[PDB]
RNA sequence: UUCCCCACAUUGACGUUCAGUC
RNA sequence: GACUGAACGACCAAUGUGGGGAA
């Protein structure tokens, strides 16, 4: 029972291991585009995830939005306070980066002129600002459970036709986990109850970053767009999550969103999304040898892939990435420049610094705070955040 | 690497900037060998490592180590004491001071037990009243990593492009003053919409906050690292220089120290803004990830053993008192004041009975510590914070 | 079921040795 | 020097399982 397929909503539109296998087929493909069959100096990897759009029943009228490989996060030294570095390079942060990139480009082609905006995939809101069109969906890979509590019990494939957990009730169930800077495993965020600072961490406190599984539950309540293009565009979920491998039932649905169903008092148009959830019909298997120290991108329309030192968030040559924090809020900048006022979503006006500017999400933040809230009162821990440092600076 | 090069002070300059870095380093360091059996010792366990030098002259072979302590943490708001038993802050940098203040207290011991140990005395009289070091005696600060708030606000690997000359396009402000957030190692910006601190309010569990290092240096490169207490004996007395293991840039370390309130304006006469030097070592530790002690360790020469003392508590672990809390500095100090006769005093404090009328006695210190204070509000970098006066008022014996 | 104790396992950094590539 | 692999050692603070116990 527990290496079965969870189905999503009340009416079904696709087969779910058709469509499983599906997007597993089409993002391990893509890589494999990528990377001249496997062949490549960067095709190797431990972990791989990919996004995957649909835009109707015709299960090929699918396309692959992004692909990535990563299993590591930023060393402490090597934070950026320019906001150039990408802090987590676990594949599926990284695949849902690239989306955010993919988006970005889909409104700048709806902005672009009016015969463009056929193909975007947005479309103008009555309630203010964009909303997808009616059939469009976004499926998330990965070719493994997201660390945390989808993976942390069971690291092993299940015998089939086994039985759910046998200790379903631990207290250790459902808590909120860190990535814990060189030390293995994800821990509760109950015993580390402080802040972090900026220069606790330079000195070599620890820095924690959350883990997958609940990284992805915050998705499944505030949407994958985050707080910037919440500005311009109506909260968007996953409508499944594939695993390529260690996939249990019990443990992904009490991660990915049945641990916090206490959520109450969401702003509107928030919700907390129970998504598609399935294993693939052939497991991936193990990929032999150390785990790369670097982490490999790449978003529809983009010749090339990004390779990032996930040691220190920027390329071999120490550049930015096209995913990082800065690059992401001049994106946000040149739309926000080319949309007409009476067309975003919130209209408070603040001052040209990183935060700030998420601050002006409003209700974002409201369901942040209701999804925090959900996390604490369920006993299962108070979200571990960045030191605020981080996301204080400009575009120059 | 211009950001990985020695600020040279605005004092005397008696020894060369990395002879001295790399001589106060290896002797800290070195000394803390000598107190731990070796570093094998459990108390040897630190994350960052202080201590101060003394220099007597040209002859850089001339230094002792004065102190030596290590330590990353504050202690606990509800753990406070009303009798002054316990040390607030035991960050090394700190500590390091007020072990630096128990030998200042020796040698005024030193000077007045007889006429024959004035010469190996560091202090003499003063034309002005009082006591002053000798003509060539300097005090250097050795930190193991850069000091917790504002000196280690920066991303160690890019690039230093902080203010331009001309306004900032956009706005200020580098500099904030910050407070060591309990429970950490850590620090976060005083807020702007500033509530003071209460005694029966913190001690139930409310914040208690504590200056970063970053800006209690800077205090001390102002009021000078003697305190209200001694300054009553003694003239003012600063750091020489500031040696740092690891985290160095002296853009951001300069302006930390000094030059984020170089508008301080009407200090009393013989105190000044202190630029020392600034200097970063030779071989630099790298950064270790992992956990931190919970204890401090302390040591002023003279002393047997290394003092171990839980920083939460601010005691140790058997929970007696430090000979580094207010208590013990209170007692030395009273000590002194029964040696002193009363016309060689600075300032007239008559029947000293409470700890804080006793600090308020020194009156020009008081005056320099407003100038302080004032400097980095007008400099738009927040208000000092003070603890609740119930800490200092007790008495002795 | 849950927790305790004990013991055995599992899951990002460090060091050493060896071989490559620019 | 940077990067990169294979073998070996020693950490990391969680999690699993077992025997023994308790509510
Ligand atoms: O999960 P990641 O892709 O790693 O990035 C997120 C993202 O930050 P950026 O998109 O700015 O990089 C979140 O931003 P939102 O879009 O959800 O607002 C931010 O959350 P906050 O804005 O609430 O800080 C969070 O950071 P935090 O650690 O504070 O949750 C941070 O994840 P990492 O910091 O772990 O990269
Ligand atoms: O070594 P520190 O931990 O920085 O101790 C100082 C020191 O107090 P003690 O010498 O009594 O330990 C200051 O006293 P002065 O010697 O400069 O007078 C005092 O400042 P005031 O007594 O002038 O107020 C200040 O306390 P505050 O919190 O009020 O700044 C306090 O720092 P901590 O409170 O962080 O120990
Ligand atoms: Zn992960
Ligand atoms: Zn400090």
Redesign the pocket.
């Known amino acids: 029972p527990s290496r079965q397929p969870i189905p999503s909503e009340g009416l079904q539109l696709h087969l779910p291991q058709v469509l499983a296998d599906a997007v597993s087929r089409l993002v391990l493909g893509k890589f494999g585009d990528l990377t001249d069959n496997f062949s490549s100096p960067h095709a190797?990897r431990?972990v791989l995830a990919g996004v995957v759009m649909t835009t109707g029943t015709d299960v090929k009228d699918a396309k692959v939005i992004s692909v990535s490989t990563g299993?590591?996060?930023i060393?402490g030294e090597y934070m950026s306070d320019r906001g150039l570095a990408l802090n987590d390079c676990h594949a599926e942060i990284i695949s849902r980066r690239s989306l955010l990139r993919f988006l970005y480009t889909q409104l700048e082609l709806y902005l672009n002129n009016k015969d463009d905006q056929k193909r975007s995939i947005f479309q103008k809101s009555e309630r203010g600002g964009f909303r997808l069109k009616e059939n469009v969906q976004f499926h998330l890979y990965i070719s493994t459970s997201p660390?945390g509590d989808a993976?942390?019990?069971?690291?092993?494939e299940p015998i089939l036709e086994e039985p759910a957990?046998?200790?379903?009730?631990?207290?250790?169930?459902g808590?909120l986990?860190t990535?814990?800077?060189?030390?293995?495993?994800?821990?509760?965020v109950r015993?580390?109850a402080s802040i972090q600072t900026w220069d606790g961490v330079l000195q070599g406190e620890?820095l924690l970053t959350m883990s997958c599984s609940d990284k992805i539950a915050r998705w499944n309540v505030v949407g994958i767009q985050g707080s910037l293009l919440s500005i311009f565009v109506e909260p968007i979920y996953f409508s499944s999550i594939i695993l390529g491998s260690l996939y249990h039932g019990d443990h992904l649905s009490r991660a990915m969103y049945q641990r916090i169903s206490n959520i109450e008092d969401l702003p509107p148009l928030y919700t907390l999304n129970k998504p598609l959830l399935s294993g693939i019909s052939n497991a991936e298997a193990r990929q032999?040898?150390?785990?790369?120290?670097?982490s490999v991108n790449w978003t529809v329309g983009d010749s090339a892939i990004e390779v990032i030192?996930?040691?220190?968030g920027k390329d071999?040559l120490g550049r930015a990435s096209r995913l990082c924090k800065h690059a992401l809020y001049c994106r946000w900048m040149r739309v926000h420049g080319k949309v007409p006022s009476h067309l975003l979503r919130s209209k408070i006006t603040k001052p040209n610094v990183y935060h700030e500017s998420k601050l002006a999400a409003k209700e974002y933040q409201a369901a942040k705070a209701r999804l925090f809230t959900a996390f604490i009162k369920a006993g299962l821990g108070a979200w571990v955040e960045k030191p605020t440092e981080q996301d204080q600076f400009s575009l120059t």
């Not at 032999?288 to 670097?294: L, S, T």
């Open positions: 190797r431990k299993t590591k996060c060393n660390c993976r942390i019990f069971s690291p092993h957990d046998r200790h379903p009730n631990r207290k250790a169930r808590q986990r990535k814990i800077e060189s030390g293995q495993g994800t821990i509760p015993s580390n620890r032999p040898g150390k785990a790369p120290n670097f030192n996930a040691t220190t071999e």
